Each structure stands twice: as structure tokens, then as C-alpha cells.
């Protein structure tokens, strides 16, 4: 099970690791991806998580993609976790360098309700440009079901430990 962690709350736990080598330990039930629109994990959090499935990954998102259409920004879909978990949530929250509403946010953080338990990033942090304290404030305040939170910057998480309210 997950260990290290710091718990911020009755249901978040925070610990400062690289979500790739959490997910290899671990083998959680569900993995949460940073995820675009479009599927394509070319950098972050997907990048890494993708590598870390050799691109099959990527593969299964393409041929989603050719099904379904794009996701919205603020939705998800439950694909493969490969060999890094059971299954992988792709996740779009708004991505504040291409200009989306930062709003969507929350909406973005209610798709974890719906699994008892998730190994997951900052959503909308990182790359996609919001204010990681903010996402982790949206994170507590949305959230429901038990979240185990991998922050892979140390400083970062020792910002966001230390500021926490
Ligand atoms: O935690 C971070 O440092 C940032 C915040 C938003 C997500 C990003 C991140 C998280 C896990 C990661 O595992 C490998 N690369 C990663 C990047």
C-alpha cells in the first residue's frame, strides 16, 4: 500500500515522489493522468507516464480518440493502466498557457469522486500554468474519496506543505 505520505486531510495525503516510480511501487487500482483534450502525452506528467508504458498508452489514446472524438476540458475517460496501475484516469483540467477557464478546475477534480482510492498529480499545475496551491486548495475542497497526491518537485512540495491551510 502507499507509504510516506503526509495527510492533509480526513481523505488527502501528499508526498514529494515522481508519480512514475510511485505508480511502478505501488500498482494502485487507479492512476490519474494530467491529460489534454486530445490524448497526447507528450510532456509532464502524461510524457513520463507514457514512456513509462513503452507508448502503448499512447496507442490505446489514439484509438479512443479515433472512437470517441476529443474529451472536454474538465472531463475524463477511464482507459488501461498497464503495467503501471489497473486503470488510468485521463484527466483534462485547464490549461492556463493555451488560455482555459481556470474554473473548470473543480469540474475537473469531481471525476475522482467517482473511485474510492487514487495515486494522482496537481491538476492544472506543472506545465499546464495555474497555481499549484490553488490546485491543491480545489483539490481539498472538491475531492471526496481517498487521494494519495505525488508532488515531483521538491521544492514545490515543500511550498505547498508549508503554506497548506
Ligand atoms: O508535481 C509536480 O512537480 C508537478 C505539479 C503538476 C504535476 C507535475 C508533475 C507531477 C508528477 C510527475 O512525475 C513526473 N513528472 C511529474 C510532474
Avoid: W
Wanted: charge should be neutral; aromatic fraction near 8%.
Amino acid at each position: 500500500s502507499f507509504s510516506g505520505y503526509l495527510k492533509l486531510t480526513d481523505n488527502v495525503y501528499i508526498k514529494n515522489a515522481d508519480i512514475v516510480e510511485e505508480a511502478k511501487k505501488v500498482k494502485p487500482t487507479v492512476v490519474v493522468n494530467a491529460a489534454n483534450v486530445y490524448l497526447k502525452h507528450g510532456g509532464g506528467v502524461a510524457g513520463a507516464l507514457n514512456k513509462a508504458t513503452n507508448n502503448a498508452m499512447q496507442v490505446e489514446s489514439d484509438d479512443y480518440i479515433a472512437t470517441n472524438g476529443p474529451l472536454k476540458v474538465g472531463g475524463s475517460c477511464v482507459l488501461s493502466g498497464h503495467n503501471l496501475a489497473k486503470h488510468c484516469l485521463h484527466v483534462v483540467g485547464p490549461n492556463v498557457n493555451k488560455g482555459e477557464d481556470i474554473q473548470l478546475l473543480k469540474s475537473a477534480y469531481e471525476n475522482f469522486n467517482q473511485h474510492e482510492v487514487l495515486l494522482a498529480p496537481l491538476l492544472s499545475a506543472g506545465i499546464f500554468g495555474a497555481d499549484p496551491i490553488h490546485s491543491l486548495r480545489v483539490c481539498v475542497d472538491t475531492v471526496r474519496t481517498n487521494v494519495y497526491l505525488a508532488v515531483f518537485d521538491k521544492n514545490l512540495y515543500d511550498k505547498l506543505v508549508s503554506s497548506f491551510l
